[PDB]
């Protein structure tokens, strides 16, 4: 779990917010996995990652990264999409396959809240649209 | 009426633009109309005034005075005439400042580049 990093369990506020210990990170371990090796090989681009083992204390992932300035990738079609500046640190914006998951991105009724992007969709439904000739 | 989406009928920007115009556009703004004599000679209405031009004053208290331009005092929008001056109480001379829109040019200081400009303007030729 994520222990609420507050000083002595002290929360300063309403009781609904007074929790410290059954609290869970909205992103997955696998994402924490991706994000750290990505910071370490910042010259690489994170393509994907997969589980490989765990014990009581650790989950273990192998992360797959690709070198955007190596000419085998830049000359390859198929992959040179990843050389584009828009895929800089995709795993830090949750665009790797783990990211898209946790982020609630899928078609259908079960993803209304969340999937044009949660925050963006909220913003839409809370915007007062005013025309020149008011309706 | 303007028609262009690229000109501004705006009083503010017009004033800013005049008042902060750099020496080179200021040259063009300080242009003067040729005399009728000179206008028939090169088929052309006006030119950017220059130093060593001969000149008639056609407006204001110095009307009728004539002379050579001594300097184009760009940073002042003004022109001074080797011969048109104020004599102070202490006998000292001091140039009068004249605007070339209030002059009329009577002898151009011609010059290879001067001629070329007249030609460029649709002026006579020779």
């Amino acid at each position: 779990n994520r222990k609420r990093p507050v000083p002595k369990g002290a929360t300063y506020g309403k009781p609904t917010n007074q929790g410290v210990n059954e609290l869970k990170y909205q992103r997955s371990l696998r994402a924490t996995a991706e994000e750290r090796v990505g910071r370490r090989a910042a010259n690489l681009r994170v393509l994907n990652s997969y589980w490989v083992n765990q014990d009581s204390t650790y989950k273990y992932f192998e992360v797959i990264l690709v070198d955007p300035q190596h000419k085998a990738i830049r000359r390859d079609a198929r992959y040179n999409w990843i050389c584009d500046p828009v895929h800089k640190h995709r795993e830090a914006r949750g665009l790797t396959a783990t990211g898209k998951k946790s982020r609630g991105i899928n078609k259908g009724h079960k993803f209304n809240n969340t999937k044009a992007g949660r925050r963006k969709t909220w913003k839409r439904q809370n915007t007062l649209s005013l025309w020149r000739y008011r309706k | 009426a303007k028609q262009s989406l690229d000109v501004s009928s705006d009083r503010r920007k017009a004033r800013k633009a005049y008042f902060t115009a750099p020496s080179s556009q200021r040259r063009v703004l300080l242009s003067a109309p040729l005399s009728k004599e000179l206008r028939a000679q090169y088929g052309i209405k006006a030119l950017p005034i220059r130093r060593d031009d001969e000149v008639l004053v056609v407006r204001g208290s110095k009307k009728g005075q004539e002379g050579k331009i001594s300097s184009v005092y760009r940073l002042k929008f003004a022109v001074q005439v080797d011969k048109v001056t104020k004599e102070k109480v202490n006998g000292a001379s001091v140039p009068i400042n004249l605007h070339p829109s209030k002059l009329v040019i009577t002898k151009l200081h011609l010059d290879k580049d001067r001629k070329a400009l007249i030609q460029r303007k649709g002026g006579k030729l020779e």
């Binding site: 913003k123 809370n126 915007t127 005013l130 025309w131 020149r132 | -």
Partner: protein, 50 residues
Amino acid sequence: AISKNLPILKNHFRKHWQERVKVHFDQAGKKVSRRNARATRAAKIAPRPL
């Protein structure tokens, strides 16, 4: 507070709504854009239909 014989309104403005007002002053502008785009697409679309 509730008074007089009036309908019960539900005007949802308890929320900082002023930070998200969208007044479409660009109504006329966007239209001129939409058309100028339609124009030039058709242009480079040779005699194709859009």
